[PDB]
C-alpha cells in the first residue's frame, strides 16, 4: 500500500506520518526530512536545496525527483510525506510507480485554515539533534530538552510557504480527485481524532 499525505505546512502530516508508519508497518519517506539530513551533511544536494528552503521556496523539481528515485523502497509499504508538491513530481511518481506495477492507493488531504496553520508553525518546537516534534502550547516539550524554533517557522516564511502551497501544491488536491483516490481529513482536530480519521480511509 502507497499512501501520499497532502496537505498546508503545519497541518500535521509528519506527526501522522511517524505514527502510522511506526504502528502499522509504513516506510516513512519525508522529503522536508531527508532535506534537512541533506543540508546538515553538507552533500550536493543539501549545500543546493538549503536556500530554497530557508526562503520558504520549494527545491527544483528535478532535484527531488532524483531524490526519490534514489531512496525509494523496493518493497513494502510506503508514506510519502510532503512529497509530491507538485504536478510534475506527481507526474514523475506515478511514472515510477506504473513500471514497478504499483500505484499511489490513497491521497490523504489534511485540510486545515490558514490561521490554524500559522498558530501551529508559530508554535512549533525541534529537537534540532533527534528531529522531534513539538507545540509551546499543544505538545510542550519537557524543561531541559533544547528546542530550537525553525527558521523557516518565522511569520514571513510561513506566509510564504503558505503562498507557495497554494499556488503550486493545491493543484494536486483535483489532480488526484480525478483519479478518485482522494480522501479528506479535518486535521484541525486534535492529534487522536485526527489520527482516527488516517486509520478509517485507510482501512
Ligand atoms: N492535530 C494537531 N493539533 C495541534 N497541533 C498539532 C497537531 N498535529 C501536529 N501539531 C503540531 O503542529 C506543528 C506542525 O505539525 P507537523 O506534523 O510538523 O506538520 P506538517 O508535517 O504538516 O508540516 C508541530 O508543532 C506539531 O507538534
Ligand atoms: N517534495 C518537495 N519538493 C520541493 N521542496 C520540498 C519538498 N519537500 C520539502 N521541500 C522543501 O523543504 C521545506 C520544508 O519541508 P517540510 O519538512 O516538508 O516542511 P513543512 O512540513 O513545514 O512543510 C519546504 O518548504 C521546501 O522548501
Not at 59 to 83: C, M, Q, R, S, T
Not at 86 to 111: I, P, R, S
Not at 161 to 168: A, F, G, I, P
Given at each position: 500500500?502507497?499512501?501520499?499525505?497532502?496537505?498546508?505546512?503545519?497541518?500535521?502530516?509528519?506527526?501522522?506520518?511517524?505514527?502510522?508508519?511506526?504502528?502499522?508497518?509504513?516506510?516513512?519517506?519525508?522529503?522536508?526530512?531527508?532535506?534537512?539530513?541533506?543540508?546538515?551533511?553538507?552533500?550536493?544536494?543539501?549545500?543546493?536545496?538549503?536556500?530554497?528552503?530557508?526562503?520558504?521556496?520549494?527545491?527544483?523539481?528535478?532535484?527531488?525527483?532524483?531524490?526519490?528515485?534514489?531512496?525509494?523502497?523496493?518493497?513494502?509499504?510506503?508514506?510519502?510525506?510532503?512529497?509530491?508538491?507538485?504536478?510534475?513530481?506527481?507526474?514523475?511518481?506515478?511514472?515510477?510507480?506504473?513500471?514497478?506495477?504499483?500505484?499511489?492507493?490513497?491521497?490523504?488531504?489534511?485540510?486545515?485554515?490558514?490561521?490554524?496553520?500559522?498558530?501551529?508553525?508559530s508554535g512549533?518546537?525541534?529537537?534540532?539533534?533527534?528531529?522531534?516534534?513539538?507545540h509551546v502550547?499543544?505538545?510542550?516539550?519537557?524543561?531541559?530538552?533544547?528546542?530550537?524554533?525553525?527558521?523557516?517557522?518565522?511569520?514571513?516564511?510561513?506566509?510564504?510557504?503558505?503562498?507557495?502551497?497554494?499556488?503550486?501544491?493545491?493543484?494536486?488536491?483535483?489532480?488526484?480527485?480525478?483519479?478518485?483516490?482522494?480522501?479528506?481529513?479535518?486535521?484541525?482536530?486534535?492529534?487522536?481524532?485526527?489520527?482516527?480519521?488516517?486509520?478509517?480511509?485507510?482501512?
Open positions: 500500500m502507497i499512501l501520499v499525505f497532502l496537505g498546508p505546512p503545519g497541518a500535521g502530516k509528519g506527526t501522522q506520518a511517524k505514527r502510522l508508519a511506526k504502528e502499522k508497518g509504513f516506510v516513512h519517506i519525508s522529503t522536508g526530512d531527508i532535506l534537512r539530513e541533506a543540508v546538515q551533511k553538507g552533500t550536493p544536494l543539501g549545500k543546493k536545496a538549503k536556500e530554497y528552503m530557508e526562503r520558504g521556496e520549494l527545491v527544483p523539481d528535478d532535484l527531488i525527483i532524483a531524490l526519490i528515485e534514489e531512496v525509494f523502497p523496493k518493497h513494502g509499504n510506503v508514506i510519502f510525506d510532503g512529497f509530491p508538491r507538485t504536478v510534475k513530481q506527481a507526474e514523475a511518481l506515478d511514472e515510477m510507480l506504473e513500471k514497478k506495477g504499483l500505484k499511489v492507493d490513497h491521497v490523504l488531504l489534511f485540510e486545515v485554515p490558514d490561521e490554524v496553520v500559522i498558530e501551529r508553525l512549533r518546537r525541534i529537537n534540532p539533534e533527534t528531529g522531534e516534534v513539538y502550547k499543544y505538545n510542550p516539550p519537557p524543561p531541559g530538552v533544547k528546542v530550537i524554533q525553525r527558521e523557516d517557522d518565522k511569520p514571513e516564511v510561513i506566509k510564504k510557504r503558505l503562498e507557495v502551497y497554494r499556488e503550486q501544491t493545491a493543484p494536486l488536491i483535483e489532480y488526484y480527485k480525478k483519479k478518485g483516490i482522494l480522501r479528506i481529513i479535518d486535521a484541525s482536530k486534535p492529534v487522536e481524532e485526527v489520527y482516527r480519521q488516517v486509520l478509517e480511509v485507510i482501512g
